[PDB]
């Protein structure tokens, strides 16, 4: 508490050293994370550049298959569907947080028309699988980058809150307790002067 | 999964075996976004840049928790002649993320 | 506390202090001196060429700074996890933990000054050359590469 | 006279004694008895009582006890970090150090003086309880590098038997000790 | 505070004290006693089998243990937020305030010892049965829930 | 610290305080008087019609309200991101910055009372009129250019 | 005795002194001698020594004093995201500030007290070094937005001449100062 013994002062000094060492530990976690974040940022941008590459090839295949072959027949070959599902958000653990890491869809082992009755359409059905795969790669990189970036800025706001509050608040309480202890010491060295005055003013001049 | 860009875009995804939607206007894009959010679809949603630039809004209003339908501001093909300006997207991302835009 | 008047005035006349610690003593280390708050204000004009040996002050500085940034990496790895450090911080971790139980945990044997320095270079040689930034070139050339 | 050890009486009596057992109040405010503050109590009669312990208790008794002391020191080192972040963001190893230090504090040091058994406790029985907790800890960290989740180590049916080790009688103890050492060897090989 | 010379000496003479806490009083709780800084040294003489009920002392022990753990996990709520608590932690945190507003709080009613003990067992029923480690197994059988 | 005996025993006998601040000094602002801890316990007499210009008390009030609100929101913008904030908060941040660069930091010149009041209105015209609650609308019509 | 200003002696001294000069050991640890810290120190005689400077050292002297003082203020300000990121990924007008702050610290503040000519430094010599650094900076900040990179600035052989400029006898300094200033003007014309 703040009831001012001598022992509370020493416990506050111990608390002050705990806060001052925790500030340096928190800064060091943030710097190691920020090196990791500036590792991931280039990997996210190159996954999206690969996504742009696969994007231009897949939209080109789709434009060619709908231009040459009919719109209605590509609607008919695309309404006949593989089961379309299979994605799942499995567990990742990053600095005190589970995040969803997606895995692939995988009905691509089961594809329609083993004799591909259109030709350019089946190139588009091969194209958009590579497209969706680069899509889920970009997804389960960017979600990690989101969580690392906001964890970091959380640490900075916890650092600045902890520093600018519990360093000056604790130093204020320490100066308060040092003041009241010095004052009681001052009262004691008043009462000692009174005892010495009353012992000398009897046993030096009585009778 | 699911995407929204355009019907011409979405039929390619439906040809992939992936659920597509398509809206001409941005409000209808948030309408279809709201549709697949309420009908919680397998956890992934891609959204074209031309309709919604930063489509976090519907899931941060509705599914504030659990982080589950992962959003992606994907690029559209009439704009993919330009190629999204991937570097500018990354600058915008780090400035949104940790506030401090610098040069890599 | 060093703000009691007894260690206050004693350290305010005397030159340096060496300071025992309950932490190394509870881990069981004899003699439990930790050398981070310890100081001799008069080592620098007592050691070196011709008095004891040439490399002494440089070895002492390198030991101090390497153990001093080994300690905070130890404190860091209780939350980071040992994977997410580099190779170099990991080598500082192994330095700190073999330092405080081969160089400090002496027992009751007598280490004359050259045995102390050969244990010093054997402890520094868990770090790569050129990580040893304080020591000048010849001593790293001559004494490195032991144990 | 204030509950502080900065008095003339206290800091004149700690300069002329060894074996200073320093009771606190937080461990007394929770009903955790005896309320010995571990971090500020000490004894200078250890080194001279080494050969007696090696003679009359067991042969490997002092190295065992210094392992208990360094587990409690590593807990008191980690308590800084865990109050400064949480038990969140501690790793697999360091949470195990927390849990083993806690189970020592609850099932070795803690001792009520109103149960009929476990108000006297001979050092055969205390050597047994320390050896059970060191065996549990050692093979749990062996099984934690080998890769499990700690959260199912912390729910095994052997932790209650180490926890109730202190309540059993000084006459039926070595049967109980052989039984729980067999079971503490056998609980982890099932992974 | 308990460090002024008058409570300091008064607790070195007598055998027990009960401390009314200022913090519980502002929650409207009457009689605002808090148990962690209060005690009575002559409990162990006069409670127990044949004289109050055999489960009395162990119920007291377990209530102090559980409520003390609930309070020092409130001190951990005070930084990490309510969300990051797992389970068998939220039951602690709900044991604490269910305790303070159903066991401590009472009006001017006279609750006999059977009422107080069955309310204590009702409150301890919230905890999982394997957690209550200071209660012997027969008493934990024939009262739980 | 104000609790030292010279600040507080002056503060009991006097009629307010004008408190210089450390943090405004390090930004090169001079005279570094911040307006939040300061007040005059008088000044209802010495303002207003005749003694000053008519609109004096309300302008002083509105400056204190707007600068308090701006300094609260730039306390909070240090915490939350600097874009998660609505439309009026940008004008309060720009008002606090324009305020402490133009109104306080006067340097050397001897501003008259009307130059201070027209700098006050010049800073208040960075705000919509519905954000100006205390100034009654007649002064809003006459001034606010 | 503790690095503990607002001790009563140090507080009374700082009330009645006129100038106060800190000596951090951290700068002595980073081998920067004289180890004065330009952050905590201060001087109250700059306002009275203004006409002496203006009539004996040079006419514009306090203005380039204040330019260098606020440039140190700026480097010490934006060391922050240097600590968060690193010196090599700033903007391009801010890595310039930290580079000129580094050359100020490594040639205008650091001073070998044992070297026979670096030890004593009058006002004409200190003014020459001071203007030379400031002229380099005011043409480099104009240059970085029109026609150069950063690596086409920091790799430039006038930087070594500013770094050597303090190792010059004052009997032969102003002849060197003319060559250095004209070489700055030429070598920044040359890009």
UniProtKB/Swiss-Prot annotation, chain A:
PANTHER family annotated for this entry?
A: V-TYPE ATP SYNTHASE SUBUNIT D
**Family affiliation:** Belongs to the V-ATPase D subunit family.
Arranged from A to Z, the UniProt key words for this protein are:
ATP synthesis, Hydrogen ion transport, Ion transport, Transport
Cysteines joined through disulfide linkages: none
Instruction: Please name the GO terms of the biological process aspect recorded for this protein, alphabetically.
Output: proton motive force-driven plasma membrane ATP synthesis
Entry keyword annotation includes DNA-binding: no
Query: Which GO molecular function terms does the record list?
Result: ATP binding; proton-transporting ATP synthase activity, rotational mechanism; proton-transporting ATPase activity, rotational mechanism
- For this entry, the protein name equals V-type ATP synthase subunit D
Checking InterPro entries in the record gives: V_ATPase_D
From Swiss-Prot, chain B:
Keyword terms of this UniProt record: ATP synthesis, Hydrogen ion transport, Ion transport, Transport
Q: Which one Pfam family would you cite for this protein?
A: ATP-synt_F
Among Gene3D superfamilies, the record links this protein to: 6.10.140.810, ATPase, V1 complex, subunit F
**Which domain of life, per UniProt?**
Bacteria
The keyword Transport is assigned to this record = yes
Q: Which GO terms describe its molecular function?
A: ATP binding; proton-transporting ATP synthase activity, rotational mechanism; proton-transporting ATPase activity, rotational mechanism
Indicate whether Ion transport appears among the record's keywords. Answer: yes
GO process terms (BP): proton motive force-driven plasma membrane ATP synthesis
Q: SUPFAM superfamilies attached here?
A: AtpF-like
Provide the function of this protein. Produces ATP from ADP in the presence of a proton gradient across the membrane.
Q: Which family does it belong to?
A: Belongs to the V-ATPase F subunit family.
The protein's matches in HAMAP family, at most eight in alphabetical order, are given as: ATP_synth_F_arch
Protein's UniProt name? V-type ATP synthase subunit F
**Organism whose genome encodes this protein:** Thermus thermophilus (strain ATCC 27634 / DSM 579 / HB8)
List the taxonomic lineage: Bacteria, Thermotogati, Deinococcota, Deinococci, Thermales
UniProtKB/Swiss-Prot annotation, chain C:
Tell me one GO molecular function of this protein. ATP binding
Presence of keyword Ion transport: yes
Q: Which GO terms describe its biological process?
A: proton motive force-driven plasma membrane ATP synthesis
- Coiled coil ranges: none
The name under which this protein is listed is V-type ATP synthase beta chain
Name the UniProt key words of this record, in alphabetical order.
ATP synthesis, Hydrogen ion transport, Ion transport, Transport
What does the similarity note say? Answer: Belongs to the ATPase alpha/beta chains family.
Describe the task this protein carries out.
Produces ATP from ADP in the presence of a proton gradient across the membrane. The V-type beta chain is a regulatory subunit.
Gene symbol here is atpB
Q: Which residues of the full protein are shown?
A: 320 to 466 of 478
From Swiss-Prot, chains D, G:
Protein task = Produces ATP from ADP in the presence of a proton gradient across the membrane. The V-type alpha chain is a catalytic subunit.
Q: Which family does it belong to?
A: Belongs to the ATPase alpha/beta chains family.
This chain's protein is named V-type ATP synthase alpha chain
